[PDB]
Design a protein around this ligand. Sequence first.
Ligand code: HEM
Ligand SMILES: C[As](C)(=O)[O-]
Ligand SMILES: [Zn+2]
Ligand SMILES: [Zn+2]
Ligand SMILES: [Zn+2]
Length: 126
Amino acid sequence: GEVTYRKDIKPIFDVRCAGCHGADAAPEYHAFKAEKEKWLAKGQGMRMDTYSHLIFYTAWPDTGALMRRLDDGKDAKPGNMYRHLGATEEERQRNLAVFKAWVGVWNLKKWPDITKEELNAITVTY
Ligand code: HEM
Ligand SMILES: C[As](C)(=O)[O-]
Ligand SMILES: [Zn+2]
Ligand SMILES: [Zn+2]
Ligand SMILES: [Zn+2]
């Protein structure tokens, strides 16, 4: 039943996200932030193509980022990565629904403003 990285997220990510967040992307977040021009010039972001690399953007250290960037916006600006979830709105919604199940709670808050109880709700099953 339960939605997991191996069964449900990685198949989507490998198609829709790894083009700019895999082998050609910055090896880590701060690697990107320190030399953005290098990566941006190739249309690349930072590595998210492994489970440990992706959960970085959920509870800690970059808490809420995956939730913020994939948000469909229901002030209604979607996050700037939502478009990558599919070629039609129906596809985007279906795939967004898989990420919300995986993450647990769709918490958009940033690290300094989040509570331990809220952190507990981020499950992110492998
Ligand atoms: C559904 C697939 C994708 C997911 C889940 C995803 C996720 C993310 C997240 C969470 C961030 C923000 C990292 C941070 O906190 O700073 C990000 C940034 C970025 N993404 Fe993606 N992304 C996806 C697809 C793509 C694609 C296909 C491209 C290129 C065509 C791309 C290019 C970038 C770039 C250049 C950044 C860094 C600049 C920025 O913050 O906008 N992403 N992505
Ligand atoms: C959130 As920090 C310590 O990388 O500025
Ligand atoms: Zn940092
Ligand atoms: Zn971030
Ligand atoms: Zn795309």
